[PDB]
Design a binder for this molecule. Sequence first.
Ligand SMILES: NC(=O)C1=CN([C@@H]2O[C@H](COP(=O)(O)OP(=O)(O)OC[C@H]3O[C@@H](n4cnc5c(N)ncnc54)[C@H](OP(=O)(O)O)[C@@H]3O)[C@@H](O)[C@H]2O)C=CC1
Ligand SMILES: NC(=O)C1=CN([C@@H]2O[C@H](COP(=O)(O)OP(=O)(O)OC[C@H]3O[C@@H](n4cnc5c(N)ncnc54)[C@H](OP(=O)(O)O)[C@@H]3O)[C@@H](O)[C@H]2O)C=CC1
Ligand code: NA
Lengths: 285, 286
Amino acid sequence: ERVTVLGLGRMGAALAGALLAAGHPTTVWNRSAAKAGDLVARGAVLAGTAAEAVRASEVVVVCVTDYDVAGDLLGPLAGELAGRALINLTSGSPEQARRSADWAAEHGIDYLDGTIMTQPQGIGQPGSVLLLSGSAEVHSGRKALIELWGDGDYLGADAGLSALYDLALLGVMWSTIASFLHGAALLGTEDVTAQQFLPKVERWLGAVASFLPGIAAQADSGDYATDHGGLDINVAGLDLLARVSRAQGIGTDVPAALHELYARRLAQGSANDGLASLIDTIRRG
Amino acid sequence: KRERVTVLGLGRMGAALAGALLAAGHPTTVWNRSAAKAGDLVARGAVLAGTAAEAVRASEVVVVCVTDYDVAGDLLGPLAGELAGRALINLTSGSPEQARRSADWAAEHGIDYLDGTIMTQPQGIGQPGSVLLLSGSAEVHSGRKALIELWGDGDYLGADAGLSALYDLALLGVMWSTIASFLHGAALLGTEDVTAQQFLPKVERWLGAVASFLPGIAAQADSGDYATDHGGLDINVAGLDLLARVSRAQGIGTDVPAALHELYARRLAQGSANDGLASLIDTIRR
Ligand SMILES: NC(=O)C1=CN([C@@H]2O[C@H](COP(=O)(O)OP(=O)(O)OC[C@H]3O[C@@H](n4cnc5c(N)ncnc54)[C@H](OP(=O)(O)O)[C@@H]3O)[C@@H](O)[C@H]2O)C=CC1
Ligand SMILES: NC(=O)C1=CN([C@@H]2O[C@H](COP(=O)(O)OP(=O)(O)OC[C@H]3O[C@@H](n4cnc5c(N)ncnc54)[C@H](OP(=O)(O)O)[C@@H]3O)[C@@H](O)[C@H]2O)C=CC1
Ligand code: NA
């Protein structure tokens, strides 16, 4: 099926490359035409203008720096985009994606927002994941196409969901990485490398990952059992982590922030509340 | 051979240790400062000794599990004479320094000493996959491997007795972090009526992808060479700011993203735009 890709930066080039290696007829457009050279070699058709590109296909994928750019670029092509399917894999906020979808509704444009959770060299590779939201009709119908980039997880019809889920997952990434590097910092004061530390974390993360189904259940039922010792002892642990961190000779930022946060849930509840009770603390802005 | 073991201290964790010993056929002698705690284990065939000294003399390996190293020291100091010649395994939780203190005392009296740290709850003693960190006497570890393997999965870390506690705390840091952040995400998604149980599969998958980033981050962390093409510190700081702001927009707290934003952005403010996330380690060191 004939498909168009607007934006040929590192990620947009990767999205088109994968459509092409599966033998889709791939029309492309980029502001800097130079970047479509390798792709047009392997057999893409480069439009002269964006309008031109849009007219070439019933599916349009867009991947550019941000939604202000997307807006500036698609707004003029609203008339040309009527009746076509639009898949926006630009990264931005829930609100921007919702606005896009609104915009797309009034101009009779089927609209699927997505957020890519891998690097360009990871497109078409196993373990690539794209979160998707907006038009279900666009998702099924183009599911084959989407699956060339990775596992496509359709989340629902609110086009904001992809961005929202993404940012929640990114939160876990940033958190996990900082805590890794704090662990490596600390064991470093004892001549253990990050790479000798690494296998233990790999093992330990498996155990942690087994903990979360129970944490999730409780967070939802609101019944906070004490399967990790209860807040009292985990708060004391964090404190001891912070104190031992200083003692060995590094900073205490990571433990400090976590201490403050778990400690707070100790106030609004009991000593024998599980960690799961911490959701309740975050819900109150 | 299922040789005779003593357990001193029979709170929930100490009692769980003793029960696994009994359940692998070890003749188990127990002591607690209050006798009735030993009720269920004596019905299961533990021998409850009259005193700590009697307990210590029954067995050639002594396991102690009490609330802290202060109580441990108050208990074991008088038994120095009695413990001399025997193996002592200390699964009390505490600091690296407390464990190094206990090791140095133990060496003074010729007490072979292994310090450990249990990384599960009582309920998970005797389950494989429950993790134990052991540090101290290589002799005791290999000589009583079969014993330690009753309680779960033994990770022997080296000769320094404080290592078990050091790693425990580092790894616990990672569990606290992942739980904090996962519930932050759960609460964020709850503003659109998505439950934590719906979110969980998406996290469990992403966790796999996150684990696969660490080898590379580990390598950079060790080398000092933070320059990246993927995981640009600058764009990640903006990612974090974006997450904080979407958080108050959807109408929850921001304490988790904000605390991280601060830390990463502090490194961006004194490193290089070119840096990758591994560079954080330089900032945590100061
Ligand atoms: N790369 C990654 O690892 C990831 C990327 N993303 C998202 O993918 C999107 C694109 O990223 P990436 O390809 O790496 O970035 P690049 O900077 O490599 O490319 C950005 C694209 O935007 C275009 N563009 C920029 N400004 C304008 C403008 N004013 N008018 C029209 N087009 C414009 C560029 O055209 P030109 O070449 O002429 O500048 C280029 O095609 C972003 O939303 C990013 O967050 C999502 C997940 C991770
Ligand atoms: N349980 C958990 O979730 C986890 C536990 N740990 C660590 O394991 C350790 C063992 O905890 P656990 O034994 O189950 O806890 P408890 O506090 O329930 O029991 C403490 C033990 O020490 C004795 N004791 C307490 N205070 C004194 C005192 N002042 N003088 C003399 N003896 C005293 C108690 O006797 P009595 O029964 O008479 O009070 C009991 O034998 C802790 O340090 C904990 O941090 C590690 C991982 C997780
Ligand atoms: Na210990």
